[PDB]
Design an enzyme around this catalytic site. Structure first.
Site, PDB file in Angstrom:
ATOM      1  N   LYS A 282       3.960   1.622  -1.211  1.00 31.89           N
ATOM      2  CA  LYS A 282       4.672   1.815  -2.467  1.00 31.89           C
ATOM      3  C   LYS A 282       3.725   2.165  -3.607  1.00 31.89           C
ATOM      4  CE  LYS A 282       5.742  -2.219  -4.039  1.00 31.89           C
ATOM      5  NZ  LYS A 282       6.681  -3.339  -3.741  1.00 31.89           N
TER       6      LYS A 282
ATOM      7  N   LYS B  59      -8.333  -1.164   6.984  1.00 32.76           N
ATOM      8  CA  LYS B  59      -9.078  -2.417   7.020  1.00 32.76           C
ATOM      9  C   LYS B  59      -8.116  -3.604   7.098  1.00 32.76           C
ATOM     10  CE  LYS B  59     -12.701  -2.910   4.354  1.00 32.76           C
ATOM     11  NZ  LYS B  59     -13.434  -3.084   3.073  1.00 32.76           N
TER      12      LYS B  59
ATOM     13  N   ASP C 231     -16.756  -7.177   2.477  1.00 35.72           N
ATOM     14  CA  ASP C 231     -15.995  -6.395   1.513  1.00 35.72           C
ATOM     15  C   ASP C 231     -16.728  -5.125   1.101  1.00 35.72           C
ATOM     16  OD1 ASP C 231     -13.635  -6.132  -0.133  1.00 35.72           O
ATOM     17  OD2 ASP C 231     -14.897  -6.612  -1.870  1.00 35.72           O
TER      18      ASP C 231
ATOM     19  N   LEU D   6       0.832  -1.199   0.000  1.00 41.46           N
ATOM     20  CA  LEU D   6       0.000   0.000   0.000  1.00 41.46           C
ATOM     21  C   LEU D   6       0.867   1.249   0.000  1.00 41.46           C
ATOM     22  CD1 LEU D   6      -2.945   1.089   0.218  1.00 41.46           C
ATOM     23  CD2 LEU D   6      -2.725   0.911   2.715  1.00 41.46           C
TER      24      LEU D   6
ATOM     25  N   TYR E  39     -11.304   1.574  -1.153  1.00 47.26           N
ATOM     26  CA  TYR E  39     -10.936   0.586  -2.161  1.00 47.26           C
ATOM     27  C   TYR E  39     -12.037   0.313  -3.177  1.00 47.26           C
ATOM     28  CZ  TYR E  39      -7.030  -0.240   0.970  1.00 47.26           C
ATOM     29  OH  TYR E  39      -5.914  -0.085   1.758  1.00 47.26           O
TER      30      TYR E  39
ATOM     31  N   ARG F 175     -27.947  -4.997  -2.357  1.00 48.73           N
ATOM     32  CA  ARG F 175     -27.586  -5.970  -3.379  1.00 48.73           C
ATOM     33  C   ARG F 175     -26.213  -5.601  -3.923  1.00 48.73           C
ATOM     34  NH1 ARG F 175     -30.870  -8.950  -7.609  1.00 48.73           N
ATOM     35  NH2 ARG F 175     -29.469  -9.417  -9.369  1.00 48.73           N
TER      36      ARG F 175
ATOM     37  N   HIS G 180     -19.730  -0.147   3.335  1.00 53.57           N
ATOM     38  CA  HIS G 180     -20.095   0.950   2.444  1.00 53.57           C
ATOM     39  C   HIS G 180     -21.605   1.042   2.244  1.00 53.57           C
ATOM     40  CE1 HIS G 180     -19.444   3.442  -1.360  1.00 53.57           C
ATOM     41  NE2 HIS G 180     -18.743   4.057  -0.426  1.00 53.57           N
TER      42      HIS G 180
ATOM     43  N   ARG H  76     -21.197  -1.782 -14.177  1.00 52.73           N
ATOM     44  CA  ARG H  76     -20.521  -1.114 -13.065  1.00 52.73           C
ATOM     45  C   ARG H  76     -21.430   0.017 -12.590  1.00 52.73           C
ATOM     46  NH1 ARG H  76     -16.480   0.090  -9.651  1.00 52.73           N
ATOM     47  NH2 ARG H  76     -15.236   1.992  -9.964  1.00 52.73           N
ATOM     48  N   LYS H  77     -22.375  -0.339 -11.723  1.00 49.75           N
ATOM     49  CA  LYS H  77     -23.399   0.579 -11.244  1.00 49.75           C
ATOM     50  C   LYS H  77     -23.385   0.648  -9.723  1.00 49.75           C
ATOM     51  CE  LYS H  77     -27.641  -0.773 -11.674  1.00 49.75           C
ATOM     52  NZ  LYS H  77     -28.958  -1.086 -12.304  1.00 49.75           N
TER      53      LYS H  77
HETATM   54  N1  LIG Z   1      -9.244  -4.096   0.522  1.00 55.07           N
HETATM   55  C1  LIG Z   1      -8.592  -4.123   1.689  1.00 55.07           C
HETATM   56  O1  LIG Z   1      -9.146  -4.470   2.750  1.00 55.07           O
HETATM   57  C2  LIG Z   1      -7.127  -3.714   1.698  1.00 55.07           C
HETATM   58  C3  LIG Z   1      -6.372  -3.521   0.513  1.00 55.07           C
HETATM   59  C4  LIG Z   1      -5.034  -3.146   0.606  1.00 55.07           C
HETATM   60  C5  LIG Z   1      -4.442  -2.963   1.842  1.00 55.07           C
HETATM   61  N2  LIG Z   1      -5.210  -3.165   2.987  1.00 55.07           N
HETATM   62  C6  LIG Z   1      -4.616  -2.972   4.332  1.00 55.07           C
HETATM   63  O2  LIG Z   1      -3.587  -2.024   4.176  1.00 55.07           O
HETATM   64  C7  LIG Z   1      -2.484  -2.390   5.005  1.00 55.07           C
HETATM   65  C8  LIG Z   1      -1.226  -2.394   4.133  1.00 55.07           C
HETATM   66  O3  LIG Z   1      -0.816  -3.744   3.793  1.00 55.07           O
HETATM   67  P1  LIG Z   1      -0.068  -4.001   2.416  1.00 55.07           P
HETATM   68  O4  LIG Z   1      -0.929  -4.895   1.577  1.00 55.07           O
HETATM   69  O5  LIG Z   1       0.160  -2.677   1.776  1.00 55.07           O
HETATM   70  O6  LIG Z   1       1.361  -4.587   2.661  1.00 55.07           O
HETATM   71  P2  LIG Z   1       1.968  -5.623   3.704  1.00 55.07           P
HETATM   72  O7  LIG Z   1       2.988  -6.461   2.992  1.00 55.07           O
HETATM   73  O8  LIG Z   1       0.798  -6.366   4.239  1.00 55.07           O
HETATM   74  O9  LIG Z   1       2.676  -4.908   4.927  1.00 55.07           O
HETATM   75  C9  LIG Z   1       3.587  -3.897   4.701  1.00 55.07           C
HETATM   76  C10 LIG Z   1       4.683  -3.997   5.670  1.00 55.07           C
HETATM   77  O10 LIG Z   1       4.122  -4.648   6.833  1.00 55.07           O
HETATM   78  C11 LIG Z   1       5.153  -5.319   7.507  1.00 55.07           C
HETATM   79  N3  LIG Z   1       4.589  -6.629   7.833  1.00 55.07           N
HETATM   80  C12 LIG Z   1       3.766  -7.444   7.020  1.00 55.07           C
HETATM   81  N4  LIG Z   1       3.396  -8.591   7.643  1.00 55.07           N
HETATM   82  C13 LIG Z   1       3.994  -8.505   8.912  1.00 55.07           C
HETATM   83  C14 LIG Z   1       4.007  -9.352  10.025  1.00 55.07           C
HETATM   84  N5  LIG Z   1       3.328 -10.558  10.004  1.00 55.07           N
HETATM   85  N6  LIG Z   1       4.698  -8.991  11.152  1.00 55.07           N
HETATM   86  C15 LIG Z   1       5.339  -7.830  11.130  1.00 55.07           C
HETATM   87  N7  LIG Z   1       5.424  -6.933  10.164  1.00 55.07           N
HETATM   88  C16 LIG Z   1       4.733  -7.293   9.047  1.00 55.07           C
HETATM   89  C17 LIG Z   1       6.407  -5.332   6.538  1.00 55.07           C
HETATM   90  O11 LIG Z   1       7.341  -4.338   6.937  1.00 55.07           O
HETATM   91  P3  LIG Z   1       8.862  -4.687   7.011  1.00 55.07           P
HETATM   92  O12 LIG Z   1       9.120  -6.139   6.688  1.00 55.07           O
HETATM   93  O13 LIG Z   1       9.702  -3.736   6.161  1.00 55.07           O
HETATM   94  O14 LIG Z   1       9.086  -4.454   8.500  1.00 55.07           O
HETATM   95  C18 LIG Z   1       5.751  -4.982   5.217  1.00 55.07           C
HETATM   96  O15 LIG Z   1       6.653  -4.294   4.361  1.00 55.07           O
HETATM   97  C19 LIG Z   1      -2.870  -3.701   5.720  1.00 55.07           C
HETATM   98  O16 LIG Z   1      -3.310  -3.415   6.998  1.00 55.07           O
HETATM   99  C20 LIG Z   1      -4.008  -4.252   4.853  1.00 55.07           C
HETATM  100  O17 LIG Z   1      -5.013  -4.862   5.596  1.00 55.07           O
HETATM  101  C21 LIG Z   1      -6.514  -3.524   2.923  1.00 55.07           C
END
Ligand SMILES: NC(=O)c1ccc[n+]([C@@H]2O[C@H](COP(=O)([O-])OP(=O)(O)OC[C@H]3O[C@@H](n4cnc5c(N)ncnc54)[C@H](OP(=O)(O)O)[C@@H]3O)[C@@H](O)[C@H]2O)c1
Ligand SMILES: NC(=O)c1ccc[n+]([C@@H]2O[C@H](COP(=O)([O-])OP(=O)(O)OC[C@H]3O[C@@H](n4cnc5c(N)ncnc54)[C@H](OP(=O)(O)O)[C@@H]3O)[C@@H](O)[C@H]2O)c1
Lengths: 432, 432
Positions: A18, A144, A231, A16, A175, A330, A236, A338-339
């Site tokens: 990057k 989330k 989701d 997220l 999202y 629904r 939402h 896409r509505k």
């Molecule tokens: N639709 C959705 O619900 C949705 C979509 C996207 C993102 N998100 C949320 O956004 C957040 C971002 O997550 P992401 O997908 O961008 O990347 P990520 O890979 O989940 O986490 C990013 C950083 O978290 C650290 N990390 C991951 N798992 C870990 C663990 N088990 N223990 C300790 N550190 C850990 C690492 O940092 P280091 O290794 O450098 O320390 C990694 O670079 C999350 O909370 C995710 O739930 C939600």
């Protein structure tokens, strides 16, 4: 509270951070929408430099050769501190580094938890005891999943709110499209306009629709842990139900409108399965592209998943304004259009007439608006703790039942409108 | 009042009778929508037989080989009496012929004046003294033009209403599309629903649009005697203005809703030219087909015609509910789309938000509905005498000024949205 802001990206090495976080703060800084004196500080365990973050994240910046001066300024305001998420000394290093920045001892601090909530308990603790500003405000942005049921969410939220006031907690959800916030804005405006009309006397049925024509697209693995209700619906669609059914707020403060949303939620009793139709999408034989593959044909989906990718649910607000008025939520993936609309059907007194609130969807693009909102302190498009608790209460017995009995969802073809049993349900509660 | 109906087509030899009247009464008889005991009697000076009328009119019947039995029955119920329109003996022959039909002495009589209003004065006189039923009801259907200004219309209407009660006068208007009546129906329903909302407090501006993408199509000759204001605005757009702005009727009787429409009209003062933008359509150089020809390129248009084929007019209802709220009537031929909508723009309190009442337009098809309405006695979609008088009052000074000074209309290209001065006017009164 002043002019100096520090933007801490907890977990800056992640996906997220990057692909989305760094690019959008780039875009806000480039368009002059961030405060003039802003610093960006990443924090994670992996030993990185700002050069590394730039190398792996600028591909997503849409960086043009005209902009390479503000881009160098932007990365000049960037720093990175490596440390563990439960190591006191690591947070001491982070805090003293922030203090070393120009006016850092008294700058506002905005902590954005780009981290799996499994670590939240640790991070929120250490921040609370090591990195909060003594002069500026401290606002945390959680991400989330806000738990997966009433119990888990309650535990996580009770932890976070024992360390931060509610006006420090920003639960961000972003999202479902670049126009996600305009949805709620126009719905609030419509509630303000048509307030006197939206009664059980004129309305026979309200429906709230979220259709997407694309499938999971090789990422059914992640979606499979949650399901279409967590989701889209529990967050939402239910928020916009609140926006439709709410009373007139005492003012336009974020917390008055959120009070009214919570009042609406406190009138909705728990939904049972007899008012629920679940569906899973199968591959289209005659279509082409990703439409040929179904949900189980996604390699990341475990064999035998009964996870629903479509749901039609009937709720009832139980007060004097709405009584026996069915709210039909629904939604689904891999559908015909896409509505995202809200239709209100009227009591005929004469074919039934309905008022349609649709949001045309193809400056700030909803995510940028939420970051700017946390900078400005507007909590309106962020779910409150009691609001979240009520949502989870409404949906948790059903979700537990689904996880326990694992009912096989009704199959529907990629590109369809979904199961005909959903139309059956709508008709059963009175629709046309 | 009974079971036997006689349908007298005064001027049965004409164009409306051959192309529209006979075909639609065919369609109503075929679909079992006419009363079971109905007779059709044509009347005109030209010495015809039912065979002649069939020969010249069945091409428009869409007659299929399956239907040739009900078609023979239909023409069995048909007769034709020839006579002059001011000859007493001719009407004596007509009346005695109707009396000779089965139960004719006591059947309802429906006189439909398929005749240029230049003869109406004579016909309505002789009917009144020679052909009205003593037992059944007598309903006359008059046809446009209902005069061309306040004075002429007043003369014609005062003549007709000195011989027939208002519940005997059906002023039919049916030349703007097969969905013409659904327009007014949904507008009435919307007035009933959004009544409490439609105030000067919530609405900043109301617009009423009638666009057609086609030109006059080799018939500018007829249109040239009237103009776009008499053709669309003074009759139809103004009726739907009434439907939008009216108070809640005392009931659903035709005359209560018509009372409310008249009350609305009695609040609109005469429009001056400073609130009027007139336009004439010129040929599209780059388009093809009829789009290459303009209005003056129609051979039937006299050289130098300043007749407007597009008009944008601003009116104001002057009461407590609406005050300073501008009603913008915009219509024209040879435009960009075939749209007939009503938009209401709201006072922002936050881009301005508007509620759009559109009528999707590509069982009865509006004309059939009006004939059935005169059979059933529902006068709702027929303009009343005072309603018509008010419309003419509102528009007559402007029309006189146009005929006197002959202002050259603003040119606009075939397929355009029209003159930009119309957008200027809308913006000047406050729009966006
Ligand atoms: N639709 C959705 O619900 C949705 C979509 C996207 C993102 N998100 C949320 O956004 C957040 C971002 O997550 P992401 O997908 O961008 O990347 P990520 O890979 O989940 O986490 C990013 C950083 O978290 C650290 N990390 C991951 N798992 C870990 C663990 N088990 N223990 C300790 N550190 C850990 C690492 O940092 P280091 O290794 O450098 O320390 C990694 O670079 C999350 O909370 C995710 O739930 C939600
Ligand atoms: N958009 C509109 O406003 C619109 C469109 C269509 C029709 N209309 C109205 O509908 C009515 C039907 O007219 P139409 O176009 O169908 O046909 P029409 O040719 O105008 O008249 C039909 C019959 O009228 C008689 N007639 C015509 N001119 C006459 C005159 N100067 N003196 C005496 N009798 C005369 C003739 O009967 P005989 O020679 O057999 O005796 C003719 O067959 C008219 O009132 C017209 O205004 C209006």
């Amino acid at each position: 509270q002043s002019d100096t802001h520090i933007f801490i990206i907890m977990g800056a090495s992640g996906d997220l951070a990057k692909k989305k976080i760094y690019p959008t703060i780039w875009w806000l800084f480039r368009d002059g929408l961030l405060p003039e004196n802003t610093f960006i500080v990443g924090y994670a365990r992996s030993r990185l430099t700002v050069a590394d973050i730039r190398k792996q994240s600028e591909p997503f910046f849409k960086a043009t050769p005209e902009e390479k001066l503000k881009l160098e300024d932007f990365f000049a305001r960037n720093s990175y501190v490596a440390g563990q998420y439960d190591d006191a000394a690591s947070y001491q290093r982070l805090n003293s580094h922030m203090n070393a920045l120009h006016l850092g001892s008294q700058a506002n601090r905005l902590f954005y938890l780009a981290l799996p909530p499994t670590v939240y308990e640790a991070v929120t603790k250490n921040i609370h005891e090591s990195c909060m500003s003594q002069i500026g405000w401290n606002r945390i942005i959680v991400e989330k999943p806000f738990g997966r049921d009433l119990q888990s969410s309650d535990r996580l939220s009770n932890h976070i709110s024992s360390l931060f006031r509610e006006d420090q907690i920003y639960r961000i959800d972003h999202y479902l499209g670049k126009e996600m916030v305009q949805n709620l804005m126009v719905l609030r405006f419509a509630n303000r306009i048509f307030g006197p009309i939206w009664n059980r006397d004129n309305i026979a049925c309200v429906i709230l629709t979220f259709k997407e024509p694309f499938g999971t697209e090789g990422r059914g693995g992640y979606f499979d842990e949650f399901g279409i209700i967590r989701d889209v619906m529990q967050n939402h669609l239910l928020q916009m139900l609140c926006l439709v059914a709410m009373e007139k707020p005492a003012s336009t403060n974020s917390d008055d409108v959120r009070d009214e949303k919570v009042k609406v939620l406190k009138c909705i009793s728990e939904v049972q399965a007899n008012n629920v139709v679940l569906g899973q999408y199968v591959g289209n034989p005659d279509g082409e592209g990703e439409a040929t593959k179904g949900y189980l044909d996604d390699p990341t989906v475990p064999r035998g998943s009964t996870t629903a990718t479509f749901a039609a649910v009937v709720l009832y607000v139980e007060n004097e304004r709405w009584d026996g008025v069915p709210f039909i939520l629904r939604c689904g993936k891999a559908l015909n259009e896409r509505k995202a609309e809200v239709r209100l059907q009227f009591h005929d007194v004469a074919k039934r007439n309905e008022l349609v609130i649709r949001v045309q969807l193809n400056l700030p693009d909803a995510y940028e608006r939420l970051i700017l909102d946390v900078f400005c302190g507007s909590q309106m498009h962020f779910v409150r703790s009691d609001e979240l608790r009520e949502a989870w209460r409404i949906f948790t017995p059903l979700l537990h039942q689904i996880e326990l009995e694992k009912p096989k969802p009704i199959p529907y073809i990629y590109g369809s409108r979904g199961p005909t049993e959903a139309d059956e349900l709508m008709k059963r509660v009175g629709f046309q």
